[PDB]
Symmetry: C4
């Protein structure tokens, strides 16, 4: 288990540096709990570095197996066929957020869409006084900024540690075009736009 | 033979990770047979990394010797002279496909052209019910999308393990311009377009 | 303290090379004093490399703590709120200059703005006969080239070793737009433009 | 002298690979003599890697000292002042050619200009039947393609091992603009254009 050692090693570097920079213990704690969640959910492997010298059609086969969980637990990504999956599975970037961390701020102009695989997030207004929803596994958000061609309509914060998949606006728009049910999503963006005014 | 050890080492990393990600044995097997074909055809060397700090005119001399096999076994790349070779030999990127793997899908908009050095590939239709050809060493494909200014006219799958050379659309168009026999290829793209309708 | 060893190691490489290239002792001395200031002010850590695999919202939290000193000692960056900080704190690049080194030359077309955290700099004319100011901790310069849409109005040299933060023109213009007090700065650029003619 | 060992090490990798790829002994020999010239002229240091983490104004001071030889031995780069040097010294990229190697081919569209620091080169016509000149230390070539806004007017081959400095077209055009004597060069491009027809 030099992995576990390497893991605890490749964080004391950060830890030593941050101790030297005299950061607060609250922040320091957030760093540690991240690295713990990082270890327990990924076991020291780095999907990028380990799969880099793989040919594209193998990178594609691995992705459909190891990142299939997202695709099976999104209840409108069935009847979609393996062609739709094919164009999307390599453009799902896994990102990790911690509890309290902002993923989207309302007014922003991003168009990236996030698919939740683990954890739960808050959908809030600008003043953060209103909680429009709680989204979790098999759900997604950040889809409205493109369908409605509008800025981000709401703020999204993490409640827990979240395993998310980020989809770039470019891949997103290409999907809607080439794969119209792109309208059950649009029929979801609307009902959210409705319950927002 | 730390090379052979390094080789078997720089794959157990992938193997351990994929075992942990709980991939299927069929996929796992495809990974292993790739790395075996990779070892036997390349012996652990990485042409990119080993030749990187070489000056351009040496990179050019090595390429004509070690990637000459392609150029000698393509029976319309003779009478082409060493000037035509010169502008093409560094833009032939070696890629590896496995049996069953799609290289080109019909309808796609790529313009990259592939030259076969080893193995054999299938030329299929969209429904894959029709097999227009079997191409192997000294043959090439993906040339029609540019000459005809059309999308990919057919699907190309590997039958075996294939050593291919990818040529970018940019280098391809520049070649046709500056080196017209660019027409025996065009007279090949036509006869294929004919036997396709 | 292999750090201190590594540090003294990762400079003898430069030192050996420069000794071999037969550089002057004055220059050689400037190299050594830089590496000393580099060690004493940073203790061998490399903020880029150590924080690279951190998620964005953590990179953001660390930055506000460890690069907060700049933001607290700039007496017009209060009442600015944590939203203004948020969009700026990751676009402050720390750079080091040595005594005598030119940071800005008049006539140049850069728009980057520099915020001083440590040390002192000279504001000079083209002929360098005139010293318009001495700027130090909590002050900044290079702001006039954008507000006035003019080339650099003056030459800026370091008097001492300076810890500066560079802000790109792109982030700078975005700040002025979205955060108008952008006018107490403009009311500072003017009074400098006045006392310059 | 692990340097000399590292040097002989970081070439047997190339040597082993090329032996395995079954290259010709003539080519193999050209590789060895390059690496020898590389060792004797650079002693295993890599100016890029060794100076990378240096601040710009130090990279600038070192360059004027270690790459000053070029600037002092070009007899029309005096009376040029340290401002002209300043904008050029970091845009001189050192490249190495071997005897027989083409640096420029006539008809080509490059605009890069080469300054000779060591060795000698041939200026030839397309048919290579004519030798317009022999250029060596303190001389330069490739300047006519930009001044005359024409393609390369002649072929340039190395006679010996040459230490050259490459200047990009972008830096070149900027120099001519901001530093007109840009005309003693133009008065050199003309006399060459004359003695060429
Ligand atoms: N009523 C709602 N219920 C659930 N999610 C919502 C609601 N309103 C907005 N959102 C999500 O909040 C997101 C903020 O960014 P977008 O506008 O790109 O996309 C928005 C939706 O994904
Ligand atoms: N009848 C055919 N015989 C052989 N190869 C073919 C035939 N039809 C199409 N192809 C190849 O299939 C390729 C699919 O992509 P392209 O259109 O770029 O180029 C096409 C040809 O190279
Ligand atoms: N009178 C002055 N007092 C202080 N700083 C000055 C004065 N004049 C010019 N400067 C600084 O010199 C800088 C040179 O570059 P800029 O024009 O971008 O911005 C200018 C100001 O920051
Ligand atoms: N008569 C000549 N004497 C010396 N150098 C020459 C002569 N003719 C051409 N050259 C060099 O050959 C070069 C080929 O490329 P360029 O046109 O950019 O610039 C040209 C000159 O530098």
């Amino acid at each position: 288990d030099a992995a576990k050692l390497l893991h605890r090693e490749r964080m004391e570097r950060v830890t030593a540096f941050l101790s030297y920079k005299k950061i607060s213990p609250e922040l320091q704690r957030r760093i540690l709990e991240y690295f713990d969640y990082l270890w327990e959910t990924r076991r020291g492997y780095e999907e990028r570095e380990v799969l880099k010298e793989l040919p594209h059609p193998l990178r594609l086969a691995v992705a459909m197996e190891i990142h299939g969980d997202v695709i099976e637990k999104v209840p409108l990504f069935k009847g979609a066929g393996e062609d739709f999956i094919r164009d999307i599975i390599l453009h799902l970037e896994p990102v990790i957020y911690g509890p309290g961390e902002y993923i989207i701020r309302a007014g922003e102009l991003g168009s990236d869409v996030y698919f939740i695989n683990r954890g739960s997030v808050e959908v809030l207004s600008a003043d953060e006084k209103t909680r429009y929803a709680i989204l979790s596994e098999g759900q997604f958000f950040g889809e409205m900024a493109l369908i409605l061609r509008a800025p981000r309509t709401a703020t999204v914060r993490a409640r827990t540690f979240c395993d998310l998949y980020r989809l770039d606006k470019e891949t997103f728009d290409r999907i809607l075009s080439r794969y119209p049910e792109a309208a059950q999503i649009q029929e979801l963006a609307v009902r959210r736009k409705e319950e927002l005014e």
